[PDB]
């Protein structure tokens, strides 16, 4: 068995938000289209769209798919992430799985999961480990 | 805690789905916009959208949330589920719950959660446990 877990930080460059229901409360649906960009070990960029069900403005729940492009050392290629995520307190944080058959390149045949917690000024941690088969 | 798990079945009535990125394999992202009806006990509308990854036409992955608006009984107001799903061997089915705090009308402090497998003509049959 091979894994390879990586511990590291990405920073979102754009954010793009468009709501299509909106009630008195406050509460609201949205989709977000994302650009976030990735340097260390894991190198390169994601776009990612995120449907997302707000509560109020500082409470949501949000669910989509990030598309990754880039290389992990030698490993080069594109998966997808599969995302469901929290937004509580100020804070957006996220549980993912690579969709399974999605990875391109030197990235097929991976499984894989991890998770991330936003930090400040468009930056979060994040935790991924892929694993052979 | 007292319990009611109700089945049933919903029709979809409307169903719009745009690619936003295709690969030269068959693979695909797209969003879809979708409206359900729903007759019996729960009786109502949903307005749905989902994000969907494609591997090929046949294998598929799904997320979102549906926005039902109906009657469950006596009760009467809406709520959104959200739902992961998966479409496989031409059968969708998806596990979802209830969003905390989404509830409106009598169904606020409703909790819950089930689960849909896909029939076919539009229709798939569902089932909801409420607290």
Redo the contacts between chains.
Sequence with gaps: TKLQTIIGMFQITAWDETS??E?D?G?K?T?AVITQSYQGVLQGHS?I???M?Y?DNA?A?F???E?FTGSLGDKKGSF?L?H?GLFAAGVASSEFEL????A?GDFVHLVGKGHFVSTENGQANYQITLQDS
Excluded: D, M, P, W
């Design positions: 299509y229901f009630s409360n509460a649906l989709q776009e769209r995120y449907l069900s509560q409470n729940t669910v989509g798919f598309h997808i599969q469901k969709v399974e058959r999605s391109t």
